[PDB]
Design a protein around this ligand. Structure first.
Ligand SMILES: Nc1ncnc2c1ncn2[C@@H]1O[C@H](CO)[C@@H](O)[C@H]1O
Lengths: 20, 338
C-alpha cells in the first residue's frame, strides 16, 4: 500500500522549507 | 458582491498599515521564555509569557546573522511588513515586533491546538468532510490574501495551527510576497512546490492554488500525492503531472484535485476567468456555507483539547538553545526597517 510506502519513507516527519 | 464589497474595505485597510507599518513595539524584558513550540528553516518559535498582562504568546525569534548568510533579509522584512498589516480570521495575529543587537522578533497570538500536521499524522487521514471544513478556510484565506497582491508560498500542514474552536490559523509568512506580476524565487516546501516554480519559469498566484490541491490530497489520503526520500525525486514527480488517487476518494474530490493539480496554468482552477469562484462553486463544496465558515459559525468537527493557559501538550518537545544578545549591534543597516 502507498500508505505503507509512505510510512517507511524518510519524509513523514515535519517538512523544512527550502531557501535555495 | 458582498465579497467584492468586503474586500474593498479590506484593501483600503491593508494599504494603510502597509504604508505605515509598526516598528519596535516592545522589548525582550517584558517577556518570560517558557518552551520551544517549534522550528522552521530560519529560526525558532517559543512559548512566552507577558509579565504585566499575564498573557502568553508565540514568539518568533530570528538571528540577524543566520538570515543574512542564508539570504533571507528581503523575505524577513516582507514577513513582518505584511503580517503587521493583514487582518483575517484565519491568519495569526502579530502583536509585537522588535529587535535587539542579535535578533529579530515577532510576538504572535499563541495558538495552542498544536499543528494540523501532528493531528493529521496521528489520526491517519481526514474524512472528506473534515477535510473540506479545513479546505474551505484556506479557500477564503487565499481569496483575501490574493486580493491584496499577496502571495503565500508556504502552505503545509505544519503551518496550519488549530485554534480553541478547532478553526485554522495560518502561521509563518517568511515567503509571502506582495507582488503585482511575476516572481521568480525558488522557495517553499518540496512536496508542495508547483511545477512552474521548479522549472524556473516565473510564477504567480496560481502556485498557491496548486498547494491547496496538494493540501487537500495530503489531508484526505494520509500522504502527499508526490513523495520520495530526496527532494529531487519529488520534483521529477511534480513536473511529471501524473497523479494516483486513492480508491476511497469521491469522484467529486478527484475532480477538484485534477483541476488544482493542473500542470497547465491556462487550465488550472484558481487562475482562470471566474477566478476563485471556479473552486468555491465546485460540487465538492456544494454543502458549503462560506458565510458561516467565515463567521466561525460552523461545525468544528474536531476540537484539540487544552489543559490550561500555556499548555504545550498539543506540540512536540524540542531541544532548547539559549538565546543570547551581543553587546555589539550586529547587521543594523540591513535591518533598518525591522
Ligand atoms: N502562533 C503560534 N502558536 C503556536 N505555535 C506556533 C505559532 N506560530 C508558529 N508556531 C510553531 O512554530 C512553527 C513555525 O512554522 C509552526 O509550525 C509551529 O510549530
Amino acid at each position: 500500500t502507498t500508505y505503507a510506502d509512505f510510512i517507511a519513507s524518510g519524509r513523514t516527519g515535519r517538512r523544512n522549507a527550502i531557501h535555495d | 458582491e458582498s465579497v467584492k464589497e468586503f474586500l474593498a474595505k479590506a484593501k483600503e485597510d491593508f494599504l494603510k498599515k502597509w504604508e505605515t507599518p509598526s516598528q519596535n513595539t516592545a522589548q525582550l524584558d517584558q517577556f518570560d521564555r517558557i518552551k520551544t513550540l517549534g522550528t522552521g528553516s530560519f529560526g525558532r518559535v517559543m512559548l512566552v509569557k507577558h509579565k504585566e498582562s499575564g498573557n502568553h504568546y508565540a514568539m518568533k525569534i530570528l538571528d540577524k546573522q543566520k538570515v543574512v548568510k542564508l539570504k533571507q533579509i528581503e523575505h524577513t522584512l516582507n514577513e513582518k511588513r505584511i503580517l503587521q498589516a493583514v487582518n483575517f480570521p484565519f491568519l495569526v495575529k502579530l502583536e509585537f515586533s522588535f529587535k535587539d543587537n542579535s535578533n529579530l522578533y515577532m510576538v504572535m497570538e499563541y495558538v495552542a491546538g498544536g499543528e494540523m500536521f501532528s493531528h493529521l499524522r496521528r489520526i491517519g487521514r481526514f474524512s472528506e468532510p473534515h477535510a473540506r471544513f479545513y479546505a474551505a478556510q484556506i479557500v477564503l484565506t487565499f481569496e483575501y490574501l490574493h486580493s491584496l497582491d499577496l502571495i503565500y508560498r508556504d502552505l503545509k500542514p505544519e503551518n496550519l495551527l488549530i485554534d480553541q474552536q478547532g478553526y485554522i490559523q495560518v502561521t509563518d509568512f517568511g515567503f509571502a510576497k506582495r507582488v503585482k506580476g511575476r516572481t521568480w524565487t525558488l522557495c517553499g516546501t518540496p512536496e508542495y512546490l508547483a511545477p512552474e516554480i521548479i522549472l524556473s519559469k516565473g510564477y504567480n498566484k496560481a502556485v498557491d492554488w496548486w498547494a491547496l490541491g496538494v493540501l487537500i490530497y495530503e489531508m484526505a489520503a494520509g500522504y502527499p500525492p508526490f513523495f520520495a526520500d530526496q527532494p529531487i525525486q519529488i520534483y521529477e514527480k511534480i513536473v511529471s503531472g501524473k497523479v494516483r488517487f486513492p480508491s476511497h476518494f469521491s469522484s467529486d474530490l478527484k475532480d477538484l484535485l485534477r483541476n488544482l493539480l493542473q500542470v497547465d496554468l491556462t487550465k488550472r482552477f484558481g487562475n482562470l476567468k471566474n477566478g476563485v469562484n471556479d473552486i468555491k462553486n465546485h460540487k465538492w463544496f456544494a454543502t458549503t456555507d462560506w458565510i458561516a465558515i467565515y463567521q466561525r459559525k460552523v461545525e468544528a468537527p474536531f476540537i484539540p483539547k487544552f489543559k490550561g493557559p500555556g499548555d504545550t501538550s498539543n506540540f512536540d518537545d524540542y531541544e532548547e538553545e539559549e538565546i543570547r544578545v551581543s553587546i555589539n549591534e550586529k547587521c543594523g543597516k540591513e535591518f533598518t526597517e525591522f
